[PDB]
Amino acid sequence: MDHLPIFCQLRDRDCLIVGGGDVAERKARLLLEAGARLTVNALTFIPQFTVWANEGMLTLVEGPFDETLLDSCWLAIAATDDDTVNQRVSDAAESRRIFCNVVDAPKAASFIMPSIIDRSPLMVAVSAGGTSPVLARLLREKLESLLPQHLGQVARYAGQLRARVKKQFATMGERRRFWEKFFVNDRLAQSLANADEKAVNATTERLFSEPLDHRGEVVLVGAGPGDAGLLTLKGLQQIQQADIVVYDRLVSDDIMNLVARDADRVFVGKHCVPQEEINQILLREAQKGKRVVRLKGGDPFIFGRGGEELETLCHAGIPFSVVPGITAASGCSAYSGIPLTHRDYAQSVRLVTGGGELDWENLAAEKQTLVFYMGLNQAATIQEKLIAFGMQADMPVALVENGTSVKQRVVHGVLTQLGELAQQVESPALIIVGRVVALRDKLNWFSNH
Amino acid sequence: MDHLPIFCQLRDRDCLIVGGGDVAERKARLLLEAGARLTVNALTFIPQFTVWANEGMLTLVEGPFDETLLDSCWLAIAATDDDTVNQRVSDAAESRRIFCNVVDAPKAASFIMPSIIDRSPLMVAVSAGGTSPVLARLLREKLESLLPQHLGQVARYAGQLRARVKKQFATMGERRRFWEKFFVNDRLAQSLANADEKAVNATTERLFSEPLDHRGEVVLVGAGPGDAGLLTLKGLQQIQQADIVVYDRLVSDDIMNLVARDADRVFVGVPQEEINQILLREAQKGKRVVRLKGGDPFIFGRGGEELETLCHAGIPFSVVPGITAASGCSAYSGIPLTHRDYAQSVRLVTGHLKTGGELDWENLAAEKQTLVFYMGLNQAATIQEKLIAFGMQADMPVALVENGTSVKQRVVHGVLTQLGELAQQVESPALIIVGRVVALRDKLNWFSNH
Numbered sequence: 036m037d038h039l040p041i042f043c044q045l046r047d048r049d050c051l052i053v054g055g056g057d058v059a060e061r062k063a064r065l066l067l068e069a070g071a072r073l074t075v076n077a078l079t080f081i082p083q084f085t086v087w088a089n090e091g092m093l094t095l096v097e098g099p100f101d102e103t104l105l106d107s108c109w110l111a112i113a114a115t116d117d118d119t120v121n122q123r124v125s126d127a128a129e130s131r132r133i134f135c136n137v138v139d140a141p142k143a144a145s146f147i148m149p150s151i152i153d154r155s156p157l158m159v160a161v162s163a164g165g166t167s168p169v170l171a172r173l174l175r176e177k178l179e180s181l182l183p184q185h186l187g188q189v190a191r192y193a194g195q196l197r198a199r200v201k202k203q204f205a206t207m208g209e210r211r212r213f214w215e216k217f218f219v220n221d222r223l224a225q226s227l228a229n230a231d232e233k234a235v236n237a238t239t240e241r242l243f244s245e246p247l248d249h250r251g252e253v254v255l256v257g258a259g260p261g262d263a264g265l266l267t268l269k270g271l272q273q274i275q276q277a278d279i280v281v282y283d284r285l286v287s288d289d290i291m292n293l294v295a296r297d298a299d300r301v302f303v304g305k306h307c308v309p310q311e312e313i314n315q316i317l318l319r320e321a322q323k324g325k326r327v328v329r330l331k332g333g334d335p336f337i338f339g340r341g342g343e344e345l346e347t348l349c350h351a352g353i354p355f356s357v358v359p360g361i362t363a364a365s366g367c368s369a370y371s372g373i374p375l376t377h378r379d380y381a382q383s384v385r386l387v388t389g390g391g392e393l394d395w396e397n398l399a400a401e402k403q404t405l406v407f408y409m410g411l412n413q414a415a416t417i418q419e420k421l422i423a424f425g426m427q428a429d430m431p432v433a434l435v436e437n438g439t440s441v442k443q444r445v446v447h448g449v450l451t452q453l454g455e456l457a458q459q460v461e462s463p464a465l466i467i468v469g470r471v472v473a474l475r476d477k478l479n480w481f482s483n484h
Numbered sequence: 485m486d487h488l489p490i491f492c493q494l495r496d497r498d499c500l501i502v503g504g505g506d507v508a509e510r511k512a513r514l515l516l517e518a519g520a521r522l523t524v525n526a527l528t529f530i531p532q533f534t535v536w537a538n539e540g541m542l543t544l545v546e547g548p549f550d551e552t553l554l555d556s557c558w559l560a561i562a563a564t565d566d567d568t569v570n571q572r573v574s575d576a577a578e579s580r581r582i583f584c585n586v587v588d589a590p591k592a593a594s595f596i597m598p599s600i601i602d603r604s605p606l607m608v609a610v611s612a613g614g615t616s617p618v619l620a621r622l623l624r625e626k627l628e629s630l631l632p633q634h635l636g637q638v639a640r641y642a643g644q645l646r647a648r649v650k651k652q653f654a655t656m657g658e659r660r661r662f663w664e665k666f667f668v669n670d671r672l673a674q675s676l677a678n679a680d681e682k683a684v685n686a687t688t689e690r691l692f693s694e695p696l697d698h699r700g701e702v703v704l705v706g707a708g709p710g711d712a713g714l715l716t717l718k719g720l721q722q723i724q725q726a727d728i729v730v731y732d733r734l735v736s737d738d739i740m741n742l743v744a745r746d747a748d749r750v751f752v753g754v755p756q757e758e759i760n761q762i763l764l765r766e767a768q769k770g771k772r773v774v775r776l777k778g779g780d781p782f783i784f785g786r787g788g789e790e791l792e793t794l795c796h797a798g799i800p801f802s803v804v805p806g807i808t809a810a811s812g813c814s815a816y817s818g819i820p821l822t823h824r825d826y827a828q829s830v831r832l833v834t835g836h837l838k839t840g841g842e843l844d845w846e847n848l849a850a851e852k853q854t855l856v857f858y859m860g861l862n863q864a865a866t867i868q869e870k871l872i873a874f875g876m877q878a879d880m881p882v883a884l885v886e887n888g889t890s891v892k893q894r895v896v897h898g899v900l901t902q903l904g905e906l907a908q909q910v911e912s913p914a915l916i917i918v919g920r921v922v923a924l925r926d927k928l929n930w931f932s933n934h
């Protein structure tokens with residue numbers, strides 16, 4: 036082992052940074068977050084240091100390095116651009132047995148600053164001893180995506196339930212299984228973060244009361260339009276914790292590859308399935324005590340029938356939550372170079388589905404961006420009706436097929452060509468009508484296929 | 485943060501353990517592996533301390549605590565079962581400004597020892613500060629199952645190449661590019677694990693020979709409406725690797741906590757072409773620039789304007805969509821934007837227009853839609869009067885969602901004839917939702933009522 040990681044308590048302890056530029060500022064922000072009683076000594080200071088000083092958050096000492104500034108110090112950081120100054124700092128700290136980091140020279144000093152993932156009280160630190168700072172960064176990024184934002188509040192609450200857990204679960208078998216359900220419960224972590232103190236006491240009692248086996252709940256998760264990079268952090272966290280994942284055709288294979296190895300999968304796409312059967316599967320699986328994730332393409336509440344699936348659960352007393360996703364309109368817009376709004380082009384964006392019938396005079400009005408979902412089959416009618424109701428024949432149009440995916444295809448033109456531009460694509464595809472479509476020739480950045 | 489993690493270099497540095505039982509034995513093994521010059525001071529010692537002392541690996545001082553043994557020390561560990569003695573050690577260490585761990589009292593004294601995942605030279609340390617040892621152990625086990633066992637060989641080889649990388653690549657941008665390729669090459673990792681030096685050298689020589697794009701870039705990133713969990717995975721990647729992040733007031737503090745600590749931050753919460761110049765400015769200097777925008781970049785965010793300069797200015801760019809306020813406020817208020825036959829259209833509408841343009845109220849008042857007004861608080865009374873005048877039913881439900889998706893989220897709701905009054909109960913940022921779907925909140929609301 037090259038270095039020993041320790042987690043220092045710095046609250047109100049004297050620490051010293053030498054240097055007053057951007058590098059020193061980053062280290063100072065870190066030590067302030069840890070509560071250090073901070074002095075910064077430098078020949079000159081960038082303005083953020085005087086802001087902090089005037090706010091009484093640290094002390095500044097302007098001038099050359101004064102090794103007596105270390106006399107009461109617990110940690111030192113040499114953060115200047117001057118190798119000679121940094122070695123003077125490093126030597127003075129060493130003679131005083133003060134752990135010291137030289138920012139530009141990790142093996143020149145007595146401690147290295149790792150990458151940090153802060154979920155205080157829970158903390159994770161990554162370092163390769165200076166051999167691989169980019170790898171430490173790549174691991175830090177992975178860990179930030181995996182650890183829920185409010186995990187620390189759960190951790191603090193856990194330590195307060197320590198003794199109570201021991202007495203109702205004598206066997207360490209059952210006991211750890213409880214903690215496994217506890218650090219995973221969404222209503223608890225939410226009630227804590229939102230300071231909803233009666234839900235915390237409620238969910239606490241429900242966690243103890245219901246059988247240890249049971250963790251029945253349904254999370255509706257928006258998978259986004261296809262690119263697995265467009266899943267939300269929380270959506271990834273939820274699919275990693277699921278006992279069973281219920282999904283359909285519009286959830287991309289790339290998203291499904293992120294689903295936990297041990298999760299049961301239930302495919303409800305597809306000859307066709309009624310929504311009521313899907314509703315009952317969610318009900319049936321949650322009633323067995325499973326943590327259920329219902330993965331839906333795009334956003335669950337935009338033409339996804341997410342509401343219908345949750346009203347079945349509200350009847351049965353099954354807890355649920357919703358993780359929004361990137362709807363097809365947002366994803367296709369970003370990846371085709373067609374902003375849904377721009378300057379004065381559109382006062383409104385309309386997301387419309389292709390029962391009555393569409394209000395064609397309403398759809399034809401000026402200063403809109405129209406986005407048709409499930410409209411390929413009525414495309415020929417859309418062209419004829421918009422033309423008949425006064426939309427200018429030179430209005431730009433675009434179709435985006437498999438938006439955000441590696442096989443995305445975008446075709447475009449004006450409105451008088453829409454009907455047979457639509458033959459050149461298949462589902463899933465969006466139709467975008469409006470002046471913003473012309474911006475594609477300037478803003479297109481994604482590969483076209 | 486509760487603690488500051490640091491990785492200490494203990495080679496040939498004096499450390500002191502007080503105590504000589506099983507706890508002290510565990511901690512002594514750690515400090516010996518780190519190369520410490522170790523003294524152990526205890527009334528009695530378990531047999532392993534004899535094995536170590538006979539091999540010359542540490543010094544035993546058999547007897548009560550001698551605080552002068554701290555005089556040359558860099559770290560102290562109090563590992564007895566006597567709380568009076570442990571406190572004497574911690575008091576003596578504190579007077580000398582020596583970081584001290586009291587093993588059975590994490591809240592006392594000045595450092596705690598984390599759980600370690602070892603991929604030397606790569607190491608990952610985990611701790612909950614003694615608050616939840618079970619969570620630390622659970623988290624430690626998943627990190628083990630995520631870090632390949634050969635990652636240490638990859639990091640070892642990187643350290644051996646660092647001097648060559650600094651010599652051959654003039655700029656930090658080029659060196660970073662090299663490492664980003666180096667650390668994801670699966671064949672190189674396999675060749676290192678197999679000690680196949682022929683294959684290692686072949687891949688390495690090709691990596692050194694590749695052109696590296698000196699281009700700075702601009703990425704527009706949708707931060708989402710506030711909950712940091714609603715950042716996209718790709719959006720997190722961008723802000724964790726950015727050189728400079730340009731952000732504004734509608735990006736939440738929690739999202740800014742995910743920006744790389746070494747990134748510079750530029751706040752622009754300021755006219756629009758002022759922002760445009762900053763982006764082009766910083767990208768022309770070869771930096772990875774992220775424009776981090778509330779919600780989605782291309783929905784009432786002026787993202788189009790921010791990009792239209794860079795096309796002929798020769799600067800590459802890309803766009804990462806985000807959760808727009810309508811989608812986030814919908815999910816977190818229990819108000820789906822569509823449902824059954826309630827809405828044929830969702831309309832995202834701006835509430836503030838050009839100094840001469842006005843909304844098409846006849847168009848907005850039509851049935852079977854969900855209206856969502858962005859930046860419309862100041863016009864709420866006008867929205868009520870106009871929607872009523874163009875035929876919307878007086879009892880149409882409405883809701884205002886303030887700071888949607890954040891822990892401070894507030895929702896007020898009523899009917900259209902109350903919209904003006906309801907809007908005075910909230911402040912920016914808030915969304916106005918108008919439509920029959922608002923009545924689903926009583927059944928679908930899961931997040932809070934504040």
Ligand SMILES: Nc1ncnc2c1ncn2[C@@H]1O[C@H](CSCC[C@H](N)C(=O)O)[C@@H](O)[C@H]1O
Pocket residue numbers: 260261285331332333334335336337338339361362363364367407408409410435436437438439462463464465
């Ligand atoms: N990747 C994609 N590219 C283009 N259109 C897509 C798409 N994914 C879904 N769609 C559109 O969405 C329709 C299904 S309705 C489901 C919409 C989903 N809830 C969402 O928020 O996006 C398809 O017919 C198609 O018009």
Ligand SMILES: Nc1ncnc2c1ncn2[C@@H]1O[C@H](CSCC[C@H](N)C(=O)O)[C@@H](O)[C@H]1O
Pocket residue numbers: 709710734778779780781782783784785807808809810813857858859860885886887888889890912913914915916
């Ligand atoms: N968290 C939030 N809660 C409610 N409204 C929000 C919000 N964040 C942004 N908004 C709305 O968005 C307006 C700014 S316009 C920026 C919108 C952004 N591009 C997006 O896609 O959401 C605000 O005036 C407010 O109406």
Ligand SMILES: [Cl-]
Pocket residue numbers: 162163164165166167168171
């Ligand atoms: Cl490193």
Ligand SMILES: [Cl-]
Pocket residue numbers: 611612613614615616617618620
């Ligand atoms: Cl802990």
